[PDB]
Amino acid sequence: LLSLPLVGSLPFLPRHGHMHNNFFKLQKKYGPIYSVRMGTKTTVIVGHHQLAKEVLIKKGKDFSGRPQMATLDILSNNRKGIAFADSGAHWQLHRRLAMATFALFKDQKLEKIICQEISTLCDMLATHNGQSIDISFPVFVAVTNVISLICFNTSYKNGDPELNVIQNYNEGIIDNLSKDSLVDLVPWLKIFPNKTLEKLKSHVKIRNDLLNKILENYKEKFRSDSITNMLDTLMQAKMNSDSELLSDNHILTTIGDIFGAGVETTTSVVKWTLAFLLHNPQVKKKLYEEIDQNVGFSRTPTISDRNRLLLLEATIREVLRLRPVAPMLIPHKANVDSSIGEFAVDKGTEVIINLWALHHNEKEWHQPDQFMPERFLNPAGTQLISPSVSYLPFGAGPRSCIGEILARQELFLIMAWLLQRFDLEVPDDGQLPSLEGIPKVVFLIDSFKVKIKVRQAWREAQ
Ligand code: HEM
Ligand SMILES: CC(=O)[C@@]1(O)CC[C@H]2[C@@H]3CCC4=CC(=O)CC[C@]4(C)[C@H]3CC[C@@]21C
C-alpha cells in the first residue's frame, strides 16, 4: 500500500498560535536554523544569538537587504524611506541624514522636548483622578508631539482633531499591513479575493496627503541659515545637489517612517509596561519606593535619574525582552551569495531573526517566560547588569534601530513621571489586561483600562 503523492508540506498550521513562537518550537526538532520554500522564494529562520549576530554584524552588509512585499510597497511608496527600503544609495543616504538630525538635540535639548510633553500628559491624566481610562491616546499625543517637534519644530495643541486623524490611519495601516506578523508562510492576499490592499492604500493616501501639506507650507519657512530639525536637514542636502535621491516623495516617506516608528513603538511599550505592573503589584510598590527614595517630590525626574532608578531601568529592559516590539525584527535579505553558520545562503534569500527565540532561550535565561526585572540587576540591586548576550531588542548592525536613544529616554521619563505622581491600579471591574499580545508589524497589547489616582504623597508635597 503506497503513500499519497505530496504537492506541499508546512511544519505547522497557518494562523494558529503566534508565528514567532511556532518557529521557536520547531527548533527542538530541526535545530536553531532552517529554511522554508514558497514557490520560488526561500526563507531562512534563525533562532540562535551566535547565528543572529553573524547575520546582523559579522556579515551585516551581506544580509542588509529587505524583501519586497505588496503591502510594504504601498506604505513605503515603492521601497523609499528607510525601514522597508532595500539596501542602496537612497536608504544609506536617508538613514545617515536621519541619524544626523538627532545631533541637533543633544544639549532644544531632547530631554526638554520630552519632559515638556510629559508634563502636559500628566496634567491631562490628573483630571481623570479616580476614574478608569485607556491611556493609549494621551500617550499617543505626547510622543506624537515629541516626534513632530523633532521633525518640523511644530506641536499640536489639546483638541487638535488632526491628532485623531493620525491615530485613525495609524491603526488602519497597522491593521492591513499584515494580518498577523509581517512573516506569512502562505501569501493569502494573492490567493483569494480581498479588499486588503485597497484599504491600506486609503489609509496611506490620507497619511500622504497630510504630509504633502506639511511640506508645501514648509517650503516657505525653510532657511539654510537655520538647521534645527529633520526636514531642514533633508532640504539642505537636497539643495546641495544625489538630487534624485532627495525628491519630495523620498523625503516624505522617510519622515513617514520616523513619524510611524517614533509613535507606535514607544506607545506600545508604555502600555505593555503598565500592563506588567498591573499583574505584578510587588514590583510596582518597589518602583514607588525606589523613586520616592532617589527623587522624592522636590522636582520632576530627569535623564540623570537613570543612575538612581535602577529597578525602573531594569523593568523597561525586561519588557523589551519578554515582549519585543518586533519579535522577528524586520525581515532581512541576502544581497550576495553568503553563508550562515557555514550553511550556504543564496542571494535574494529571505533571512528572519527570531528575536523571540533569543529572548526565551532556556540555556541563556532563568525562567524566561517570567516577568523578572531583577534579572537585569545584581543580587544586591546596586547596579544594572547584562545577564545574557542573547538580547537584541533594537537589533544590530546596518539595519539597527536609529531611535534607540530617543526611545529609551522617552520610556524612562514617561514611566518615572507617572509613578512619581500616579497610583496606577486595577480598574473597578477587576479585569486585568491579557499579556498574550497581538502580533502585528508591532507586537501589540489588547487595549485595557487602568484606574488612575493622584498620589497621596504627591498631594501633600504641594
Ligand atoms: C521603543 C522601542 C523600539 C524598539 C524595540 C525598536 C526596534 C527596532 C528593530 C527591531 C528594528 C529593525 C531591526 C532590523 O530590521 O534589523 C528597528 C528599525 C528601525 N527603527 Fe526602531 N525601535 C524602537 C523605537 C524606534 C524609534 C523611537 C524610532 C524613531 C525614529 C525608530 C526608528 C527606526 C527606523 C527608522 C528603523 C529602520 C532602520 C533601517 O531599516 O535601516 N525606532 N527598530
Ligand atoms: C517596530 C519597528 O522596528 C519598526 O518600528 C521600524 C519602522 C516602523 C514602521 C515605519 C512606517 C509606519 C508607519 C505608520 O504610520 C504605522 C507605523 C509604521 C508601520 C511603523 C511601525 C514600527 C516599525 C515597523
Swiss-Prot record:
Q: Which CDD domains match?
A: CYP17A1
The protein's matches in Gene3D superfamilies, at most eight in alphabetical order, are given as:
Cytochrome P450
Residues reported in the UniProt entry to bind heme: 401
Which reaction is this enzyme known to catalyze?
Answer: a C21-steroid + reduced [NADPH--hemoprotein reductase] + O2 = a 17alpha-hydroxy-C21-steroid + oxidized [NADPH--hemoprotein reductase] + H2O + H(+); progesterone + reduced [NADPH--hemoprotein reductase] + O2 = 17alpha-hydroxyprogesterone + oxidized [NADPH--hemoprotein reductase] + H2O + H(+); pregnenolone + reduced [NADPH--hemoprotein reductase] + O2 = 17alpha-hydroxypregnenolone + oxidized [NADPH--hemoprotein reductase] + H2O + H(+); 17alpha-hydroxyprogesterone + reduced [NADPH--hemoprotein reductase] + O2 = androst-4-ene-3,17-dione + acetate + oxidized [NADPH--hemoprotein reductase] + H2O + 2 H(+)
User: Cellular location of this protein?
Assistant: Endoplasmic reticulum membrane; Microsome membrane
Output the Gene Ontology cellular-component terms: axon; endoplasmic reticulum; endoplasmic reticulum membrane; neuronal cell body
* KW GTP-binding (keyword) present: no
InterPro entries given in the database record: Cyt_P450, Cyt_P450_CS, Cyt_P450_E_grp-I, Cyt_P450_sf
The pathway to which it is assigned is: Steroid hormone biosynthesis; Steroid biosynthesis; glucocorticoid biosynthesis
Asked if GTP-binding is a keyword of the record, the answer is: no
Q: Which cysteines form disulfides?
A: none
Outcome of altering residue 365 to L?
A: In AH5; complete loss of both 17alpha-hydroxylase and 17,20-lyase activities
Main localisation: endoplasmic reticulum
Task: Cite the PANTHER family for this sequence.
Answer: STEROID 17-ALPHA-HYDROXYLASE/17,20 LYASE (PTHR24289), STEROID 17-ALPHA-HYDROXYLASE_17,20 LYASE (PTHR24289:SF13)
Protein role: A cytochrome P450 monooxygenase involved in corticoid and androgen biosynthesis. Catalyzes 17-alpha hydroxylation of C21 steroids, which is common for both pathways. A second oxidative step, required only for androgen synthesis, involves an acyl-carbon cleavage. The 17-alpha hydroxy intermediates, as part of adrenal glucocorticoids biosynthesis pathway, are precursors of cortisol.
Protein name listed in UniProt: Steroid 17-alpha-hydroxylase/17,20 lyase
Provide the organism lineage as a comma list.
Answer: Eukaryota, Metazoa, Chordata, Craniata, Vertebrata
